[PDB]
Amino acid sequence: IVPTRELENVFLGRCKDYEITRYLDILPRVRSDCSALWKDFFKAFSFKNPCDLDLGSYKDFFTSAQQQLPKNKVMFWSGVYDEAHDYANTGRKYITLEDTLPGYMLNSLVWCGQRANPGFNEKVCPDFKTCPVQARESFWGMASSSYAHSAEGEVTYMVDGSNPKVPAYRPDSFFGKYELPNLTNKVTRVKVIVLHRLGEKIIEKCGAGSLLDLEKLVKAKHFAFDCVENPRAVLFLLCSDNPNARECRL
Amino acid sequence: AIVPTRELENVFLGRCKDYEITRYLDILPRVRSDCSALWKDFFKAFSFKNPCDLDLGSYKDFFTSAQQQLPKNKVMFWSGVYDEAHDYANTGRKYITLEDTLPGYMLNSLVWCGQRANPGFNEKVCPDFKTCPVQARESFWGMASSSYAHSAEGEVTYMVDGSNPKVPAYRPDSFFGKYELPNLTNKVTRVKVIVLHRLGEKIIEKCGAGSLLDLEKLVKAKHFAFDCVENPRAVLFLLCSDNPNARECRLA
Numbered sequence: 149i150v151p152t153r154e155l156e157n158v159f160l161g162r163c164k165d166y167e168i169t170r171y172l173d174i175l176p177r178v179r180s181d182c183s184a185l186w187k188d189f190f191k192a193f194s195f196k197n198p199c200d201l202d203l204g205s206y207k208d209f210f211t212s213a214q215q216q217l218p219k220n221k222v223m224f225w226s227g228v229y230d231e232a233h234d235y236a237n238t239g240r241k242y243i244t245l246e247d248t249l250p251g252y253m254l255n256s257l258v259w260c261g262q263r264a265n266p267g268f269n270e271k272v273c274p275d276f277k278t279c280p281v282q283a284r285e286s287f288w289g290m291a292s293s294s295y296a297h298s299a300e301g302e303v304t305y306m307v308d309g310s311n312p313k314v315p316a317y318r319p320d321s322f323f324g325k326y327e328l329p330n331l332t333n334k335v336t337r338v339k340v341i342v343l344h345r346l347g348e349k350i351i352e353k354c355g356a357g358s359l360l361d362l363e364k365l366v367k368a369k370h371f372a373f374d375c376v377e378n379p380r381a382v383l384f385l386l387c388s389d390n391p392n393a394r395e396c397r398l
Numbered sequence: 399a400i401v402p403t404r405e406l407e408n409v410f411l412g413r414c415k416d417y418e419i420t421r422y423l424d425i426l427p428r429v430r431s432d433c434s435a436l437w438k439d440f441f442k443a444f445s446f447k448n449p450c451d452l453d454l455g456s457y458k459d460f461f462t463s464a465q466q467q468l469p470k471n472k473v474m475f476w477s478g479v480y481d482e483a484h485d486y487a488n489t490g491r492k493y494i495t496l497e498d499t500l501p502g503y504m505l506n507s508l509v510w511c512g513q514r515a516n517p518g519f520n521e522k523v524c525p526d527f528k529t530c531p532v533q534a535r536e537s538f539w540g541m542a543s544s545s546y547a548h549s550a551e552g553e554v555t556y557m558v559d560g561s562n563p564k565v566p567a568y569r570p571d572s573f574f575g576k577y578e579l580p581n582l583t584n585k586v587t588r589v590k591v592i593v594l595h596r597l598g599e600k601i602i603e604k605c606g607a608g609s610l611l612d613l614e615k616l617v618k619a620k621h622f623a624f625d626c627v628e629n630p631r632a633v634l635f636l637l638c639s640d641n642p643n644a645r646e647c648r649l650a
């Protein structure tokens with residue numbers, strides 16, 4: 149597993165590009181400058197064995213980097229990276245974590261500590277599975293927590309309803325572990341979009357299975373809940389990529 | 399009265415670095431110049447000059463250095479349809495657009511201009527689009543499009559608005575007509591037009607008539623193949639996602 153070349157420059161270049169040119173009208177700028185953000189990000193992991201982290205390690209970084217997020221616009225997703233993002237349309241319809249400053253700066257990057265200079269590795273990172281969960285999930289787990297914790301109003305959750313393996317809702321997923329349970333009383337509703345992949349056996353439906361379980365969690369948290377299976381707007385997006393699928397019939 | 403981008407250099411450098419290490423890795427190749435070199439090349443093109451003192455050759459050195467090889471059959475040119483083309487091209491998953499290339503990606507949306515005084519460029523103001531001569535205002539994006547078009551191979555796609563009563567699909571003076579079409583080379587084998595007809599609007603342009611027919615004849619005179627389609631289903635579905643109730647989006 150190969151860490152990212154010149155992490156600092158990449159970090160700082162994204163940070164700066166975001167700062168001046170990205171999400172201008174969609175999300176707010178952040179107070180701390182880009183060098184400040186690097187220091188907080190890098191103190192979390194540097195000069196330590198790669199597994200030497202926990203859920204607190206990147207705390208300062210997420211405090212510094214948390215943006216206020218617009219009412220009613222925040223989205224969560226499980227198992228449907230590409231569809232949730234095509235449909236969230238780069239901040240235009242919904243915010244996703246990847247549109248936010250920390251999400252955007254670290255999206256897809258790979259990096260790890262080493263005890264010895266220069267304090268991070270530049271040849272190899274260990275397999276996440278080798279590290280305790282709280283080190284494996286230190287970074288994206290707390291990123292999820294901070295994002296969820298800032299949401300207000302309606303939130304939207306896009307799931308996979310077409311996977312026999314992974315059920316739609318799961319306590320053990322990142323939405324299950326860090327997001328749904330960090331939703332504050334500023335949240336008024338969870339609106340689930342169930343994604344049913346085209347030409348594939350339908351697994352989870354609203355009102356059933358894991359989607360029932362979540363309905364119950366959502367209500368137990370004092371939120372309103374709704375759930376829709378392939379709403380026309382999403383359906384269409386799925387249909388541009390497989391136009392002959394029966395589901396897209398004219 | 400137009401406001402330039404703050405920290406131009408830092409923005410350039412940020413985007414160039416981001417791009418190099420992380421963008422389009424499996425889709426477009428890296429250039430050999432490093433970011434600082436490409437900046438030098440960019441900067442000398444317009445610095446220490448009248449904001450309006452620029453011609454089609456000013457950025458020649460920057461583009462030579464910045465030009466990637468483009469993959470067979472994936473290049474796309476667009477007219478009057480920014481969002482739709484780029485959504486359809488889907489970040490180089492389906493087609494490449496200028497905006498996915500290195501110079502496109504670094505400079506997209508940025509606003510800049512030179513000044514004869516220290517320090518070579520203006521950060522306060524940049525002139526009204528319409529003051530400078532055609533050759534000077536189109537100096538950066540004109541050459542960008544020439545160079546991109548010059549690098550295209552195989553079958554190119556051209557996505558056009560066919561619902562604009564004021565602007566024909568094909569025009570000798572658009573970017574396509576002026577800079578892309580004339581720089582298509584022997585590497586190119588076919589031009590594939592996609593006419594986009596906006597939902598709930600009068601259809602204005604059709605394959606085999608008007609300016610499209612003119613295009614067909616120009617393309618064939620250059621010994622390239624030609625097709626043209628109107629609202630192909632995959633594109634239609636894209637429009638339909640933004641306007642699901644539109645008459646044209648009926649199912650079953």
Ligand SMILES: Nc1ncnc2c1nc(Br)n2[C@@H]1O[C@H](COP(=O)(O)OP(=O)(O)OC[C@H]2OC[C@H](O)[C@@H]2O)[C@@H](O)[C@H]1O
Pocket residue numbers: 223224225226227228229245255256292295320321322323324
């Ligand atoms: N371009 C990309 N950039 C980044 N990642 C990409 C990617 N493409 C893919 Br493909 N992933 C993958 O998605 C996998 C885990 O997600 P999941 O199982 O689908 O769902 P969750 O557990 O609920 O976690 C998601 C929730 O927390 C974050 C956000 O708030 C969201 O709501 C990752 O391990 C990647 O491999």
Ligand SMILES: Nc1ncnc2c1nc(Br)n2[C@@H]1O[C@H](COP(=O)(O)OP(=O)(O)OC[C@H]2OC[C@H](O)[C@@H]2O)[C@@H](O)[C@H]1O
Pocket residue numbers: 474475476477478479480495496506507508539543571572573574575578
């Ligand atoms: N977000 C953005 N960021 C930056 N710029 C944006 C922009 N959004 C727009 Br909208 N433009 C501008 O729209 C102007 C003219 O486009 P046009 O009138 O629709 O068609 P053409 O004259 O035939 O030129 C098309 C060719 O340009 C290169 C590409 O390969 C394509 O083939 C462009 O010059 C942009 O400045």
Ligand SMILES: [Cl-]
Pocket residue numbers: 389390391392393
């Ligand atoms: Cl199909």
